[PDB]
Structure 1
Amino acid sequence: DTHILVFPFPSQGHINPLLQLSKRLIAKGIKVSLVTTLHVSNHLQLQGAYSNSVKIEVISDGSEDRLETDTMRQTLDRFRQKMTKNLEDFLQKAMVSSNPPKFILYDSTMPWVLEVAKEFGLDRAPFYTQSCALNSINYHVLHGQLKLPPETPTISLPSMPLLRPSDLPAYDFDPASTDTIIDLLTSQYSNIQDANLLFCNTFDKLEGEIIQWMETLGRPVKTVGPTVPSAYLDKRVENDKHYGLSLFKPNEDVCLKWLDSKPSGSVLYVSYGSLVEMGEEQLKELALGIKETGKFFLWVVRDTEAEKLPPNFVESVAEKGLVVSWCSQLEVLAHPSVGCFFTHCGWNSTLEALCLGVPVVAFPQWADQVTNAKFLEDVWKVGKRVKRNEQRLASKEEVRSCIWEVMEGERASEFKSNSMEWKKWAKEAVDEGGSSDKNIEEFVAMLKQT
């Protein structure tokens, strides 16, 4: 039996994609051990009950954890030194055991894993959990064809759409972290020469040209996405309705009953992200913009954010708006009453919109979200970006008009038509003989050749 290690970066947004790939691998008979920290194993129940369940390997004592006093460098230098020793310690034992691991698949955000694999003579592959488009951008920043301040008003990278400065990741919301973030991002492409493969959380129909460009860098590139549960795609992995490894523990939901009573394709599902902190002025323009559409909306917004809503807002939308602390985004997006998705354009939510065939109103906030929004609007053509002002503030009218344009406007039919197509192609890719299934089959066969 073939054994591999999967080593995600310990942050929500990064763990899910690897857990999901780990499920496709165990479904093809690979034994998977998940290498992770004391902190992640305490807050997630990763241990399934079965013979083929992912084995959880805690390799840290918690002393590598982020302190709230830390400057980003401090958090990263410490994480690296301690986790480097932890992995080395783990491999010193694992590699001389009964059936040692034949591979380590690690989040591309931890390129120092490659150096450890190299010392132990262990086959290794980084996993790029965000768009291939952002692999092009960061590679070009690394090799100098692109600067941290864009040197021109239009950027034409090879095999890419034209990008403006406002289409490029904005990592500068904390002008103290920006350089640290960019060096960490650009450092994921420096040591690829020694990578067995480069895994990408995308699919060939979505980013084909960019993936073909990446293949020119000299290593085999395997598209294995989207990492969305099987029950919403090919449905070949029994019970796969959630991101996690252990048996799904349903919350008590009010959202689906509410959606059941609204017309087919009628309601705007609103989520500007579980991690985004939105200022009160923008929050109010967003709220009144949604209200000024007169459409049914379901808005999921956590209590610390909900606190910042205009005092009488929730009461004023008693008829049309359901504003709640939690729903299952996957179950909401899959619901026939949901016609449009107002999103922050995080890669994970972007893949879910594409997979579940829901047109978007793109309200990107930080980082790769701006580039994800550019592709959703101009490349995949499944909706529109809220126009924002010089101040970056999106007015209530620009929120209202954008929602109306996507849901009711001239290109409304086109957005839905294109979303149904991307839903088909996404399912195709992960279904038997799909571009992604074939990359996973190929990988599994290679592993079996030890």
Structure 2
Amino acid sequence: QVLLLPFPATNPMLQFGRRLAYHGLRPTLVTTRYVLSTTPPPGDPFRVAAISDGFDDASGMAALPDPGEYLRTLEAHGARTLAELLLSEARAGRPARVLVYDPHLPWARRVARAAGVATAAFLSQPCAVDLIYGEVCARRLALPVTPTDARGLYARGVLGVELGPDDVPPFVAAPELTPAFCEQSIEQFAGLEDDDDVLVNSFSDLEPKEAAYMESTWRAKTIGPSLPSFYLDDGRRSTVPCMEWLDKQPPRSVVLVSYGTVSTFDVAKLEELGNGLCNSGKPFLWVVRSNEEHKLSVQLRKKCEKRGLIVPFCPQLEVLAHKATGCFLSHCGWNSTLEAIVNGVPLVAMPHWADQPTISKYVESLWGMGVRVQLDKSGILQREEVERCIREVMDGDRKEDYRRNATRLMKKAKESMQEGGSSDKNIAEFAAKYS
């Protein structure tokens, strides 16, 4: 079997597993006992299997909100139970042919290699960010990484844009705001040189210098965007109520709003975001997660409820593919960004941390498919700014420029994953290797 081990939370690794199954491989999703008991399995063509993070009954992340402590606990129990799993699978007649793993779990590679199982690292961040972390891991850049260092990489043809202070990945530019995440970002690459394969959820045409560098440096092969085949127009509709609302809207009219599944916004930040949205005048679909809703006042919720819909969950790819969708106000997490690209949807970028500031810079300055919100002197996003950016992308002099670039990259993204495409060829090479 092909074992797939994402960070326990994913869809891009599952999408790659669907393609492996197309090619006659047998994928298994590996997740925590907790997650397996408290969510539906993926279904065919996948098996599922479980490891433990120490909290099979309760959410260990809830239980352990300090990141270092959670990660140390996940390693302890995860490495032991992943070892047990590799043995029990072999004994059950289903020995792992390869472990595909998120290298935010670097212990997974140690365990597999000790069990004699091939390993395939699966990076789901852009090549531009991954390569920066790698240069630190390899002791070619010291901490903190600076704009000066980034400029060197741009001048050497490794990075395709010059990253300023607000564009360098904060986990290495300002390490220690986030010590555990700094360590985790860099340790992805520690030992990656002994993996059998290295894979990245991107496409060459998007990040050509960075992909090329990742390939020559780390053997990384692009396999993305790792999304459902339907969205990539590769021939080899839901009933969710938000969709019915979207159906009634005019073409390219609606702002989708999401800051993702992980970041938390305080009451002040939700106030500026929600007021900016109302103040724009645009219809909007604002996904505010169940676990964040308590911070949204009645007043702000009802403020413009004749134009805007607030929901706890929307099928985002289906939303992005909808004719009524005009732009996406997004934190520009990588999955969000690729889903916007594959649907040709212009972006208003409101990054927080991790890969988002870098992504945002590429969005506005190389890809040209949107704009990034400008924070004021104290680093606060103002409602006037939120509104200005929405209006810039939906009504500016440059509105067709953002749409054109989004469309352009949509087509390249599709070409990459279709038969003959740069990503398709890498996926096929992997499937053959492990067949």
Is the shorter-chain TM-score for this pair beyond 0.5, marking a shared fold? yes
Residue 142 of structure 1 corresponds to which residue in structure 2?
137
Q: CA deviation at 1:220?
A: 2.7
Q: Matched residue of 1:138: which SS?
A: helix
Alpha-carbon separation, structure 1, partners of 2:357 and 2:253: 27
Contact 2:175 2:182 in 1 (8 A): no
Contact 1:17 1:227 in 2 (8 A): yes
More off after superposition, 192-201 vs 148-157: 148-157
Contact 2:31 2:49 in 1 (8 A): yes
Q: CA RMSD in A?
A: 2.4
Residue 247 of structure 1 corresponds to which residue in structure 2?
none
Alpha-carbon separation, structure 2, partners of 1:264 and 1:98: 54
Q: Matched residue of 2:207: which SS?
A: helix
Alpha-carbon separation, structure 2, partners of 1:304 and 1:446: 43
More off after superposition, 406-415 vs 303-312: 303-312
Q: CA deviation at 1:97?
A: 5.6
Residue 341 of structure 2 corresponds to which residue in structure 1?
354
Q: Is 1:345–2:340 an aligned residue pair? A: no
Contact 1:9 1:107 in 2 (8 A): yes
Matches within 5 A, 1:18-33: 18-33=13-28
After superposition, what is the alpha-carbon deviation per residue over 1:342-379, rounded to whole angstroms, capped at 9, x for unaligned?
11111111111101110011011222111111111112
Matches within 5 A, 1:190-229: 190-217=190-217, 219-229=218-228
Q: Matched residue of 2:342: which SS?
A: helix
Residue 245 of structure 1 corresponds to which residue in structure 2?
none
Q: Is 1:54–2:52 an aligned residue pair? A: no
Q: CA deviation at 1:291?
A: 1.9
Q: CA deviation at 1:99?
A: 5.1
Q: CA deviation at 1:275?
A: 2.6
Q: Matched residue of 1:205: which SS?
A: coil
Q: CA deviation at 1:221?
A: 1.8
Q: Matched residue of 2:120: which SS?
A: strand
Residue 262 of structure 1 corresponds to which residue in structure 2?
249
Q: CA deviation at 1:324?
A: 2.5
Identity value in percent: 38
Residues 337, 213 of structure 1: alpha-carbon distance in 2 compared, 3 angstrom cutoff? same
Residues 263, 66 of structure 1: alpha-carbon distance in 2 compared, 3 angstrom cutoff? closer
The residue type equivalent to 2:120 in the other structure is A
The residue type equivalent to 1:17 in the other structure is P
Q: Is 1:186–2:181 an aligned residue pair? A: no
Contact 1:203 1:224 in 2 (8 A): yes
Q: CA deviation at 1:171?
A: 4.2
The residue type equivalent to 1:213 in the other structure is Y
The match for 2:70 among 61, 72, 75 is: 75
After superposition, what is the alpha-carbon deviation per residue over 1:98-137, rounded to whole angstroms, capped at 9, x for unaligned?
4532211111112222222322332211111111111112
Residues 145, 315 of structure 1: alpha-carbon distance in 2 compared, 3 angstrom cutoff? same
After superposition, what is the alpha-carbon deviation per residue over 1:5-52, rounded to whole angstroms, capped at 9, x for unaligned?
2222212xxx2221111111111110112222201212332252x5xx
The match for 1:274 among 261, 275, 296 is: 261
Contact 1:5 1:105 in 2 (8 A): yes
Contact 1:234 1:428 in 2 (8 A): no
Runs (5+) with no aligned partner, structure 2? none
After superposition, what is the alpha-carbon deviation per residue over 1:289-338, rounded to whole angstroms, capped at 9, x for unaligned?
22222222221212453433355333331332222333221221111111
The match for 1:4 among 2, 5, 24 is: 2
Alpha-carbon separation, structure 2, partners of 1:389 and 1:146: 30
Q: Matched residue of 1:104: which SS?
A: strand
Q: Is 1:41–2:33 an aligned residue pair? A: no
Alpha-carbon separation, structure 2, partners of 1:151 and 1:210: 18
Q: CA deviation at 1:61?
A: 8.0
More off after superposition, 147-156 vs 206-215: 147-156
Contact 2:146 2:168 in 1 (8 A): no
Matches within 5 A, 1:7-406: 7-11=5-9, 15-46=10-41, 48=43, 53-60=45-52, 62-63=54-55, 65-66=60-61, 68-69=63-64, 71-95=66-90, 98=93, 100-152=95-147, 155-156=150-151, 157=153, 158=156, 159-160=158-159, 161-171=161-171, 178-217=178-217, 219-236=218-235, 253-309=240-296, 311-406=298-393
Alpha-carbon separation, structure 2, partners of 1:308 and 1:70: 19
More off after superposition, 104-113 vs 313-322: 313-322
More off after superposition, 150-159 vs 194-203: 150-159
Contact 2:53 2:74 in 1 (8 A): no
How many residues get paired?
A: 426
Alpha-carbon separation, structure 2, partners of 1:147 and 1:285: 37
The residue type equivalent to 2:228 in the other structure is P
Q: Matched residue of 1:269: which SS?
A: strand
Alpha-carbon separation, structure 2, partners of 1:406 and 1:216: 37
Q: Matched residue of 1:342: which SS?
A: strand
More off after superposition, 53-62 vs 36-45: 53-62
- Normalised to the residue count of structure 1, the TM-score between the two structures is 0.88
Runs (5+) with no aligned partner, structure 1? 242-249
Contact 1:114 1:194 in 2 (8 A): no
Alpha-carbon separation, structure 1, partners of 2:195 and 2:257: 40
Q: CA deviation at 1:176?
A: 7.1
- Normalised to the residue count of structure 2, the TM-score between the two structures is 0.90
